[PDB]
Amino acid sequence: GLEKLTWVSEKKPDWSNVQKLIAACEATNQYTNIGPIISQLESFIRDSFLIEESKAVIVTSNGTSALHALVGGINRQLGRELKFVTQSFTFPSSNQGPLKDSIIVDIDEDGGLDLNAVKNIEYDGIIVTNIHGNVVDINKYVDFCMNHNKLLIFDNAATGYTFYLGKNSCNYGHASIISFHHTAPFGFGEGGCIIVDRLYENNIRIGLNFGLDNSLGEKSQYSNQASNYRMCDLNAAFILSYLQNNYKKIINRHSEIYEIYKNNLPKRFKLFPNHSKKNPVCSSICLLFDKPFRLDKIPFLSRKYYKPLDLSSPVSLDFYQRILCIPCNIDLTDRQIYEIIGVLNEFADKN
């Protein structure tokens, strides 16, 4: 039964629908530099993911370029290269591009950047990762950054539809980013999205286009903080089509998969720390064993994320050593989930 597990659901273009969308590009020859699909996808994300009016929805080439475009747009707006802190327990994106010199601190046992490690250092802002659809105690980060006059970015690459105190977690902090990578529940190919305070929208949007704004004619000015960060309308069509056809099923079924693990926890495993009242929509089901173990002991498709960016961060390393990332996708059967739980019970008994 577990032989046919896949990391990602089988995804295939709805060709008739993708062709209908890109017909708009064919009619004007505008397939990028903000063609006719970008507004359609940004709208659909706003309305389907429930983003608030005080937030821009800005699609980009990938989750990484969503984070980098966000920072570059903010840097240009403030006339300074801002210094960010990120947690060790995250993907490389938050220590690359305009963040290549970001400060790396440990997480606390609740899965997010340890606020204790930024008490006595110089920084403009923090990046907190909501791990694989799970969310931190978001209001403790909002409150701290408010009291210290710091920018707050949520790395929601893997966290497009987990609700915190009645709204999409993407609506908290000054900004968040989402990934539409093929491996994300909502993704298809490559893509990213910035959810950000309107204060920064214009500088971020022109910052996808080297800083250039055609509407300014002769005073259009590049920024050395910008790049080519835009989403191509081809990619926007594939992602919008996948979302139109699947987004509601993904939300419901991922929540149901979470329910089975929550009510049938395997022996000596705990759910990854989460602070949502309703079940999170996960990119994988993250469990923590009570002690370090190797993946090669687990006899079905599984992974460990995230190898600490700084291998010296103790909680990050402990989590990495104890974590199991189980496939979570709309192809999973309840039968496969109960078989996985039975295998992990057996794993615990032998280990």
115 binds, among ligand Z7P, Cl ion, a copy of itself, none (CB under 5 to 8 A by kind): none
Cβ closest to a copy of itself, residue 146 vs residue 311:
311
Spell out the SS3 assignment of the chain. Answer: CHHHCCCCCCCCCCHHHHHHHHHHHHHHCCCCCCCCCHHHHHHHHHHHHCCCCCEEEEEECCHHHHHHHHHHHHHHHHCCCCCEEEECCCCHHHHCHHHCCCEEECECCCCCECHHHHCCCCCCEEEEECHHHCCCCHHHHHHHHHHHCCEEEEECCCCCCCEECCEEHHHCCCEEEEECCCCCCCCCCCCEEEEEEHHHHHHHHHHCECCCCHHHHHHCCCCCCCCECECCHHHHHHHHHHHHHHHHHHHHHHHHHHHHHHHCCCCCEEECCCCCCCCCCCCEEEEEECCCCCHHHCCCCCECCCCCCCCCCHHHHHHHHHEEEEECCCCCCHHHHHHHHHHHHHHHHHC
61 binds, among a copy of itself, Na ion, ligand Z7P, none (CB under 5 to 8 A by kind): a copy of itself
User: Scanning residues 226 to 265, which ones bind Na ion (CB under 5 A)?
Assistant: 245
Cβ closest to ligand Z7P, residue 13 vs residue 348:
13
Cβ closest to Na ion, residue 260 vs residue 330:
330
Sole binder of ligand Z7P in the list 9, 17, 30, 336 (CB under 6 A): 30
Does position 91 interact with ligand Z7P (CB under 6 A)? The reply is yes
Does position 42 interact with a copy of itself (CB under 8 A)? The reply is no
Stretch that binds Cl ion, among 83-91, 227-235, 249-257, 273-281 (CB under 5 A): 273-281
Sole binder of Cl ion in the list 245, 252, 333, 351 (CB under 5 A): 245
Does position 31 interact with ligand Z7P (CB under 6 A)? The reply is yes
Cβ closest to ligand Z7P, residue 151 vs residue 239:
239
Does position 276 interact with ligand Z7P (CB under 6 A)? The reply is no
Q: Please report, as ranges, the residues that interact with Na ion according to CB under 5 A.
A: 245
